[PDB]
Amino acid sequence: EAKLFGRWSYDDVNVSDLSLVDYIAVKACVFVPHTAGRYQKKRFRKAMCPIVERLVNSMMMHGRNNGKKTLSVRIVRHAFEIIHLMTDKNPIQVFVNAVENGGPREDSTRIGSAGVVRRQAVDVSPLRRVNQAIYLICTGARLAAFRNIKTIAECLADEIMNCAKESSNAYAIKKKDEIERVAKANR
Amino acid sequence: QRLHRIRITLTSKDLKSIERVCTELINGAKEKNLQVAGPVRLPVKTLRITTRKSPCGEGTNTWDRFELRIYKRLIDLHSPSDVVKQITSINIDPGVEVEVTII
Amino acid sequence: PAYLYETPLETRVHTVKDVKADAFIALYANHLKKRGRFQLPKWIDYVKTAHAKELAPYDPDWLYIRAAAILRHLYIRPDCGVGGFRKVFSCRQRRGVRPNHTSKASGKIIRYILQQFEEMGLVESDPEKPGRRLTKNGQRELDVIARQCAK
Amino acid sequence: FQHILRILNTNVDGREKVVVALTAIRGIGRRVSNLICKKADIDTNKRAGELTADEISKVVAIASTPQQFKIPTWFLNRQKDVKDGKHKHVVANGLDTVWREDLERLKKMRLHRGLRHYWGLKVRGQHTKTTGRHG
Amino acid sequence: KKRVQTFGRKKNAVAVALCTQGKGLLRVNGCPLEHLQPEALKVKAFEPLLLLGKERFQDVDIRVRVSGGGYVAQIYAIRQAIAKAVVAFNQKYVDEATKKEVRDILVAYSLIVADPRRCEPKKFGGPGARARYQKSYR
Amino acid sequence: QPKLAKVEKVLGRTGSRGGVLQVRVTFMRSLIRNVKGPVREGDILALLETEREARRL
Amino acid sequence: LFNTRPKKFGPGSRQCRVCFNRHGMVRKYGLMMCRQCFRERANQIGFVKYR
Amino acid sequence: NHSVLFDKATYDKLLADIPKARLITPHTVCERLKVNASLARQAIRYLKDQGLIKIVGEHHHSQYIYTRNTS
RNA sequence: CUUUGCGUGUCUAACGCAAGGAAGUUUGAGGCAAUAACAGGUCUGUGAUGCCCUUAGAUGUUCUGGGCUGCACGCGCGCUACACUGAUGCAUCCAACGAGUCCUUGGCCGAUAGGUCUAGGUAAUCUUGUGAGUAUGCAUCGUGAUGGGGAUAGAUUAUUGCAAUUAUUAAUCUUCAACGAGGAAUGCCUAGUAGGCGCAAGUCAGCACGUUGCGCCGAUUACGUCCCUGCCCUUUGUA
């Protein structure tokens, strides 16, 4: 069985692309995004959590909004309902396809060969690309609704659908290409 | 004589001082074979003071964490008061406050 | 996809604890008007319900819902009084520039509603025993409308 | 429909609810404006851009003489007037002139408190080494 | 009569779930599980019902008595105490082979274990436990 | 565009601050590359440049 | 007449028995001990610090 | 920026306007319209009771979120 | 016991990973703390003290009153903020550390503070199961410096004290500023931890925006490194 909010089934659906596979934790699965459990003793317990839990967990910011997971459960429960409303299929399959495309491919590290702070082209790991994906999803949605009288759930639902899409309107998909602008040049 | 009920309080700072008394006075009762219940160990009232270590303000503001501990323990009996005076009066301990009470 | 799950048996509707507590107050507030008995204060224009609160309540039936809530709360904890009911409707006062603290509820309004229940005789002393309690007629007033609201 | 308004020689705005619109009048605030709205029998659901001639006429009467409609005295701004010696409600540009009287009273009397208004320092006894600096 | 009683522990919460033979009613203090706000976590309490099934629990009843902790910690105590009850209900009366099924399907899904994370004490020269205040320099 | 490659073994850890990490990959062939985040053996990752081999160390 | 105000309350009322000093007066459990005085004699009273 | 009353020109349109749209929220009324969010709540509460539209979920006290009825 | 399995090592000392287990970083967190010192700080913690000062027209002592709070302006620790994951009004129901010869239930009066008449408590017994607040549910508000923000200011009612003015606080009504995420610099921190949210104790007649403990809600990101800032041990150079 196992369904999120009881209205969705973990069973069925699929990972979008090779890589970022097995790093993601689907398959089995827990109704309700939330789980208080030990995930930070080893350094790859972080990709045992299902990514809906990692969304609600990292959705609390900044100092003022931290904690209150029960609050972040609600606004994600509304967000998955809205995703369903447009281009209806599976909120999870749209969300999994979003965090596939969300994070950056390559990155600029500072290796100078002694003396200088000089940039150099380095590809990103599969774990960090999932870490950066869910971070960049939220920081678009939070900044989008920070001053506007638009509910955060609306921003999150909108941000996720956009990320799956190639519109580039999103903050996340821009900040992918903003890094890949400089990462091309640092080759 | 008459059917009475006695419940004797014990208090001290040390654990080791009372564990003499709890073992001794129950065996002192079992000379005469009175209706003993075992020693009821109450929760420990830990007293606490935290002062600064330094006399003046200088250096990092470091602190002591001083503690006392107090151990209320209760030997239960059902026996008249003339019988118990032999048991308590012999085997008094150094620095252990003890008070016998009917009911 | 509809919502899953039940309990094994269909839940018994008899006592007041089986009723959801907010939905109880929605019914019994309306019962106080349509019956008529309970009677109004003079001061209703003023108040706000607490020293801590900085504004008066919006809903004009704030007294009936409070008298509805306090009467069921006697069933939850039998023994309680006025300083008890000051704690249960406590709240975060905002001190100003300073950090926040707790504060106790209003003593006039919480005492008065109990005296109106004493006049009918649903909640009563207890003159020697410290704290108010609901009587026999108090329970049957509650438990008859517990079955009605779920129906 | 009426955009913009004026009650008691002070400009009340439209596009605001009737309770909060009345706080734009000087010497009125949030808790008393509810008692004005409740005892004038105005619906709080209505908007301050409307306000018929019956509604404003009641508010001016209550604002002038709130002792008539059983407001029990602790709600009033200048409670015990210290001139005629009664429970008094000061509204609008009366409150400007009353503040001009009460400060210039204390300058003639020559209190310490009056000299703080004269120099324009902090009055209430606050540590002005560091705070209230810029001026 | 058939009786077992069991406890769970999240943090400083504790929840003694007595259970007996009966009709099929699961109750906290004297509510239904249908209440238990926050409501969002209401689904969380029903977790051992969904995994094991309805038709096991209808032979028994459970009555839980809870204190300590907070809002969320009280749910996790009840979560454990219901799951620990029906596992421990076998040992006394019902066949001992079916314990290995009903326990290990829940373990395949810390419902009996209880995670011992407790609050580390504060130390001097700082606001939090490990956090410190601020160094000034010049 | 991007073409996938499987990790044989972590080689060391590279750079001044030690954050970037050096890996032998195998296409899906072998060459040495640098990678950012947490990586272990039995792992697969995308590369835009199939060429461009990192210095041995 | 002279040599006495009302001396009932506040730090001027009371002093350290051991050293006659008002400042840093530990009055928990009725010690009446100035802190410089209290810390060095704390083991002899009963107080033993741990954790 | 926004208009506070019903605007009884647009009330005749507002029967037609909102059941067209796929999303029905607080925001989508003042998207189509240029009025404060508050009217939108009493609009979609009116369109529950009188008119067509239906809840996506039974309810919530913060984010409403209706669909078009499709009938 | 790092027990068992497989790797890693002159397979010696011991590491890594997986399974099992309440727990496998020495299981987590503290107390205790060497030899050398530094012209560190404290004669204002002391009946710990040498020397000097002054000793009745006093630097002893003590009484009335003021001052340490005085403001063109710099610097350091904190608190509340800028909102809609929100503010406000109603309802729902959950903690642990204390602490009292003062802590306060119960009943009447009062919008409030608070008062008044009884009443339990030398305390696992009474206050107290301290019905704590972030939280949850249902309403109104609508992006406006607005109901976010509560400084600044007038007027009134109680409380502690022998005395409240430079206002000790707590209330009730008003008064409605700056501030739209903070320039250069730079602090703290690796799991029940950060951060947020309260509570209790210490000083206390009265006063916490402070410190010391206590729980509750509970994340993100490392599991490496010697680039910056310091540290320890070798070889090396020194005027």
Short mmCIF file of C-alpha atoms in Angstrom, two decimals, chain C:
data_model
loop_
_atom_site.label_atom_id
_atom_site.label_comp_id
_atom_site.label_asym_id
_atom_site.label_seq_id
_atom_site.Cartn_x
_atom_site.Cartn_y
_atom_site.Cartn_z
CA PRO C 1 -8.61 8.91 -4.71
CA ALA C 2 -10.85 8.99 -1.60
CA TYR C 3 -9.54 8.86 1.97
CA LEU C 4 -8.77 5.43 3.45
CA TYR C 5 -9.20 3.80 6.87
CA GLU C 6 -11.72 3.33 9.67
CA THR C 7 -11.73 1.99 13.20
CA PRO C 8 -12.80 -1.72 13.37
CA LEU C 9 -16.32 -0.85 14.63
CA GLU C 10 -18.47 2.22 13.88
CA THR C 11 -17.85 4.62 16.75
CA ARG C 12 -20.38 4.90 19.61
CA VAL C 13 -22.09 8.30 19.85
CA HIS C 14 -23.19 8.19 23.50
CA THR C 15 -20.99 10.32 25.81
CA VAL C 16 -19.55 13.83 25.25
CA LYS C 17 -15.88 12.79 24.81
CA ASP C 18 -16.74 10.95 21.55
CA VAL C 19 -17.98 14.28 20.12
CA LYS C 20 -15.33 16.59 18.60
CA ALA C 21 -14.98 19.52 21.00
CA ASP C 22 -15.29 22.46 18.55
CA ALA C 23 -18.41 20.97 16.89
CA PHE C 24 -20.02 20.59 20.35
CA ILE C 25 -19.59 24.34 21.01
CA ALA C 26 -21.12 25.26 17.60
CA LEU C 27 -24.41 23.53 18.57
CA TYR C 28 -24.66 24.42 22.28
CA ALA C 29 -23.96 28.14 21.69
CA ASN C 30 -27.09 28.22 19.50
CA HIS C 31 -28.97 26.24 22.20
CA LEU C 32 -28.36 29.07 24.73
CA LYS C 33 -30.10 31.65 22.49
CA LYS C 34 -33.09 29.52 21.42
CA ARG C 35 -33.77 28.30 24.98
CA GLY C 36 -33.51 31.87 26.36
CA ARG C 37 -32.31 30.99 29.87
CA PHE C 38 -28.74 32.06 30.89
CA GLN C 39 -29.30 35.85 30.69
CA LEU C 40 -27.04 38.71 29.50
CA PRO C 41 -24.56 40.92 31.39
CA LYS C 42 -24.64 44.73 31.22
CA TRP C 43 -20.94 45.10 30.32
CA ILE C 44 -20.90 43.12 27.04
CA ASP C 45 -19.90 46.25 25.08
CA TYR C 46 -16.50 46.23 26.89
CA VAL C 47 -14.15 43.40 27.90
CA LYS C 48 -11.96 41.64 25.27
CA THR C 49 -11.66 38.65 27.64
CA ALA C 50 -8.17 39.27 29.03
CA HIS C 51 -5.67 41.74 30.42
CA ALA C 52 -3.17 40.49 27.83
CA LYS C 53 -5.39 40.89 24.75
CA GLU C 54 -5.06 44.25 22.99
CA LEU C 55 -8.44 44.13 21.23
CA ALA C 56 -12.10 43.21 21.86
CA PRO C 57 -13.56 39.99 20.34
CA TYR C 58 -15.12 40.22 16.85
CA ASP C 59 -18.01 37.75 17.22
CA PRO C 60 -21.01 39.17 19.16
CA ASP C 61 -21.74 35.73 20.72
CA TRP C 62 -18.31 35.46 22.43
CA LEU C 63 -19.98 34.95 25.84
CA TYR C 64 -22.17 31.98 24.81
CA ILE C 65 -19.28 30.03 23.21
CA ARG C 66 -17.18 30.70 26.35
CA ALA C 67 -20.02 29.46 28.59
CA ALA C 68 -20.37 26.49 26.21
CA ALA C 69 -16.63 25.71 26.43
CA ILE C 70 -16.37 26.04 30.24
CA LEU C 71 -19.38 23.73 30.85
CA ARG C 72 -17.91 20.81 28.85
CA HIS C 73 -14.52 21.47 30.51
CA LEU C 74 -16.09 20.59 33.90
CA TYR C 75 -16.69 17.08 32.46
CA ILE C 76 -13.00 16.78 31.43
CA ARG C 77 -11.61 17.77 34.86
CA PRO C 78 -14.35 17.48 37.58
CA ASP C 79 -12.67 19.65 40.26
CA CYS C 80 -11.71 23.23 39.30
CA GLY C 81 -12.37 26.90 40.18
CA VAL C 82 -11.85 30.50 39.12
CA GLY C 83 -8.04 30.64 39.37
CA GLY C 84 -8.06 27.32 37.50
CA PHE C 85 -10.11 28.78 34.63
CA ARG C 86 -7.75 31.80 34.53
CA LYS C 87 -4.95 29.39 33.51
CA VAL C 88 -6.92 27.41 30.85
CA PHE C 89 -7.72 30.57 28.84
CA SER C 90 -4.22 32.06 29.28
CA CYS C 91 -2.33 33.55 26.32
CA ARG C 92 0.85 35.18 25.02
CA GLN C 93 0.86 38.84 26.04
CA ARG C 94 3.14 41.04 23.92
CA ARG C 95 5.10 43.13 26.42
CA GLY C 96 6.46 45.53 23.81
CA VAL C 97 10.12 45.89 22.89
CA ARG C 98 10.72 43.22 25.60
CA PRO C 99 10.43 39.40 25.19
CA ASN C 100 7.06 37.64 25.48
CA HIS C 101 5.48 36.11 28.61
CA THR C 102 2.33 34.33 29.84
CA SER C 103 -0.64 36.04 31.48
CA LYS C 104 -3.86 35.03 33.26
CA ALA C 105 -7.45 35.48 32.02
CA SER C 106 -10.22 37.85 33.17
CA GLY C 107 -11.81 37.01 36.55
CA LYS C 108 -15.11 38.93 36.31
CA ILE C 109 -16.43 37.31 33.11
CA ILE C 110 -15.27 33.77 34.01
CA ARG C 111 -16.93 33.97 37.48
CA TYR C 112 -20.22 35.46 36.20
CA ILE C 113 -21.03 32.67 33.70
CA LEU C 114 -20.60 30.10 36.52
CA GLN C 115 -23.08 32.01 38.73
CA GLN C 116 -25.66 31.89 35.89
CA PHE C 117 -25.19 28.09 35.67
CA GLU C 118 -25.61 28.02 39.49
CA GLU C 119 -28.98 29.83 39.15
CA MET C 120 -30.32 27.06 36.89
CA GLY C 121 -28.28 24.52 38.89
CA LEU C 122 -26.06 22.63 36.44
CA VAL C 123 -22.71 23.48 38.09
CA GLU C 124 -22.58 24.00 41.89
CA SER C 125 -20.61 23.91 45.17
CA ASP C 126 -19.01 22.13 46.86
CA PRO C 127 -19.13 24.65 49.73
CA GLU C 128 -16.63 22.67 51.87
CA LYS C 129 -14.90 20.85 48.97
CA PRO C 130 -12.50 23.25 47.18
CA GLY C 131 -13.61 23.76 43.55
CA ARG C 132 -16.82 23.64 41.49
CA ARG C 133 -18.40 20.51 39.98
CA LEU C 134 -21.30 19.63 37.65
CA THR C 135 -24.43 18.00 39.16
CA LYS C 136 -26.81 15.24 37.92
CA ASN C 137 -28.99 17.62 35.86
CA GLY C 138 -25.74 19.05 34.39
CA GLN C 139 -24.76 15.74 32.74
CA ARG C 140 -28.15 14.98 31.14
CA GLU C 141 -28.18 18.53 29.68
CA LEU C 142 -24.77 17.77 28.08
CA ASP C 143 -25.33 14.13 27.04
CA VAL C 144 -28.75 14.64 25.35
CA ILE C 145 -27.17 17.15 22.88
CA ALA C 146 -24.05 14.98 22.31
CA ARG C 147 -26.15 12.48 20.31
CA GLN C 148 -27.93 15.33 18.45
CA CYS C 149 -24.86 17.03 16.91
CA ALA C 150 -23.40 13.92 15.22
CA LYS C 151 -26.95 13.15 13.99
#
